[PDB]
UniProtKB/Swiss-Prot annotation, chain A:
Record GO biological process: calcium-ion regulated exocytosis; endoplasmic reticulum to Golgi vesicle-mediated transport; endosome to lysosome transport; eosinophil degranulation; Golgi to plasma membrane protein transport; neutrophil degranulation; phagocytosis, engulfment; positive regulation of dendrite morphogenesis
This protein's UniProt keywords: Acetylation, Coiled coil, Cytoplasmic vesicle, Endoplasmic reticulum, Endosome, Exocytosis, Golgi apparatus, Lysosome, Membrane, Phosphoprotein, Protein transport, Signal-anchor, Synapse, Synaptosome, Transmembrane, Transmembrane helix, Transport
Protein name: Vesicle-associated membrane protein 7
Domain named Longin: residues: 8-111
GO cellular component terms, A-Z: apical part of cell; cell surface; endoplasmic reticulum membrane; Golgi apparatus; lamellipodium; late endosome membrane; lysosomal membrane; neuron projection
PTM annotation (N-acetylalanine): residues: 3
Compartments it resides in: Cytoplasmic vesicle, Secretory vesicle membrane; Golgi apparatus, trans-Golgi network membrane; Late endosome membrane; Lysosome membrane
Domain of life assignment: Eukaryota
Membrane topology, as annotated: Single-pass type IV membrane protein
Predominant localisation class: membrane
UniProtKB/Swiss-Prot annotation, chain B:
ANK repeat extents: 4-28, 39-68, 72-101, 105-134, 138-167
Effect of residue 20 to D: Disrupts interaction with VAMP7
Subcellular location: Early endosome; Late endosome; Cytoplasmic vesicle membrane; Lysosome
Protein name stated in the entry: Ankyrin repeat domain-containing protein 27
Region of the whole protein represented: 665 to 895 of 1050
Source organism: Homo sapiens
Gene: ANKRD27
Length: 157, 191
């Protein structure tokens, strides 16, 4: 059971690449997360049920992941900074105008390799990252108007 | 029996995660600054253990208890001393944490720091009033332990600060008859 469940790279509400390792309503949740993210540089964690959602937005690109609530934020943010560094190096400014999923056939496997790596088990850089990354609650809406929960199935894929 | 929330909190403390601690405790579900894991580990213990000096003032600001005893009757000073965390020790000593507290093995903060070779803690503790000659349940002193474990710089510092060399541990040995024959340590124990 890898504790990092899902990850994406997005600009605005447009997802450029994604990867999940099991089944769940990740895109439904993720799309409602994206629409709340200011396009100015920022970092944030939302706590929701037994999960946490984390991203970094930088130079308009959002690097986001969803994890169990017992994976340390340091480990999460390091995952994201690593994904980002690769994304930035490989695609540069292309990401500014890319269409939906344009990076997905190339990068989702990079996302998969890093998610695996970072999910399998220190430095001070990594814990000081966390300084001023607030933790917040998030209002998410289900189909019939009630509170939407992230509902996954670890049995899958 | 549900420690799952407590564990959330202590994992955040342990990771040095101030904004998480803040969210989970609701600063500026029954969690509090002094709750315990099953162990007796309070946040302050965990913070000390992992050397999270930036958390400590805040925990103490919200009422963490620096004399809280875990299941070893260890206080957070013990752990910070076991691990050699200068700023944590400093911060706690400056918030009036008491340096002469013994845990169930009869050990003290000074003895753990010396045992562990953390010389950068010795003077600091002595300044705040650690008894240089207190002994643990084996009858060992900070100096006994430094010698057994061969921490030369610690030995130096304890002798400099006047630590007795005549204390007999429970097997009738003294710092001296615990050193190597011809150790640099041995030389030191003569002057």
């Amino acid at each position: 059971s890898m504790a990092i469940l899902f990850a994406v790279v997005a600009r605005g509400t447009t997802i450029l690449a994604k990867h999940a390792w099991c089944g769940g309503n990740f895109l439904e949740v993720t799309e409602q997360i994206l629409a709340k993210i200011p396009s100015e540089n920022n970092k944030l964690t939302y706590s929701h049920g037994n999960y946490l959602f984390h991203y970094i937005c930088q130079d308009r690109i959002v690097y986001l992941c969803i994890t169990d609530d017992d994976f340390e934020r340091s480990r999460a943010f390091s995952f994201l900074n690593e994904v980002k560094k690769r994304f930035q190096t490989t695609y540069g400014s292309r990401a500014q105008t890319a269409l939906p999923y344009a990076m997905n056939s190339e990068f989702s496997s990079v996302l998969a390799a890093q998610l695996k790596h970072h999910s399998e088990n220190e430095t001070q850089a990594q814990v000081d990252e966390l300084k001023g990354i607030m933790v917040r609650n998030i209002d998410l809406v289900a189909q019939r108007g009630e509170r939407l929960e992230l509902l996954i199935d670890k049995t899958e894929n | 029996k549900d420690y799952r929330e407590v564990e959330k909190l202590l994992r955040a403390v342990a990771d040095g995660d101030l904004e998480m601690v803040r969210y989970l405790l609701e600063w500026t579900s029954g969690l509090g600054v002094n709750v315990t894991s099953q162990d007796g580990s309070s946040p302050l213990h965990v913070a000390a253990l992992h050397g999270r000096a930036d958390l400590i003032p805040l925990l103490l600001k919200h009422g963490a208890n620096a004399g809280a005893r875990n299941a070893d009757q260890a206080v957070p000073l013990h752990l910070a001393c076991q691990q050699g965390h200068f700023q944590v020790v400093k911060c706690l000593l400056d918030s009036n944490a008491k340096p002469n507290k013994k845990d169930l093995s009869g050990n003290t903060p000074l003895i753990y720091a010396c045992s562990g070779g953390h010389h950068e803690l010795v003077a600091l503790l002595l300044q705040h009033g650690a008894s240089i000659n207190a002994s643990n349940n084996k009858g060992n002193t900070a100096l006994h332990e430094a010698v057994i474990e061969k921490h030369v710089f610690v030995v130096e510092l304890l002798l400099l600060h006047g630590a007795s060399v005549q204390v007999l541990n429970k097997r009738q040995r003294t710092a001296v008859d615990c050193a190597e024959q011809n150790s640099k340590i041995m030389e030191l124990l003569q002057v």
